[PDB]
Amino acid sequence: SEVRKVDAFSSIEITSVGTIHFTQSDTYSFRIEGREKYVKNTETTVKDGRLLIGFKDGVTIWISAPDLKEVEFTGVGEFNCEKPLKLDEVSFEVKGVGEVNVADLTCNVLKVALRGVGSADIHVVCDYLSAQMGGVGSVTLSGSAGRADISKGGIGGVNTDNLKIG
Numbered sequence: 471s472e473v474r475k476v477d478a479f480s481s482i483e484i485t486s487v488g489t490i491h492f493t494q495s496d497t498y499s500f501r502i503e504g505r506e507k508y509v510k511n512t513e514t515t516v517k518d519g520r521l522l523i524g525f526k527d528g529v530t531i532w533i534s535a536p537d538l539k540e541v542e543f544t545g546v547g548e549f550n551c552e553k554p555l556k557l558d559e560v561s562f563e564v565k566g567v568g569e570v571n572v573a574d575l576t577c578n579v580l581k582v583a584l585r586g587v588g589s590a591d592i593h594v595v596c597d598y599l600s601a602q603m604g605g606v607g608s609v610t611l612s613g614s615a616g617r618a619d620i621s622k623g624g625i626g627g628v629n630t631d632n633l634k635i636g
Contacts, residue, residue: 480539483521576594614635
């Protein structure tokens with residue numbers, strides 16, 4: 471289990487392979503675990519408040535930050551947040567092969583785009599919710615949304631059976 475010093479970030483982009491566990495906290499923190507050859511080949515950089523996780527040339531990553539605006543899952547793996555999350559506007563994009571699991575989100579605006587292969591399973595209380603599943607997989611939404619704009623152009627399904635409108 472390696473700890474890395476990282477600059478303040480409010481967005482996360484992962485282009486390599488790995489499981490991310492996110493915790494909302496006033497303290498920024500980055501911890502990585504796995505085989506030494508994969509941990510040493512995992513590059514982390516913060517540019518203009520965006521945390522970039524990629525290859526230098528499967529790890530488990532624990533991240534904490536007070537705010538989260540964008541999650542761009544360009545690579546392969548999972549993005550998990552099981553603890554309560556209170557945000558303003560947050561967007562989740564699965565372009566690669568990914569899985570987004572958010573157990574307890576409160577926000578103004580939620581944006582979800584499953585462009586690649588995978589799934590998004592989110593429990594949310596929000597004012598506006600936007601979801602699109604153009605790829606191959608499924609989006610499962612539960613909780614409540616004041617307004618919801620949902621489309622499913624791809625292969626799979628969008629499940630909103632337990633999502634309250636209003």
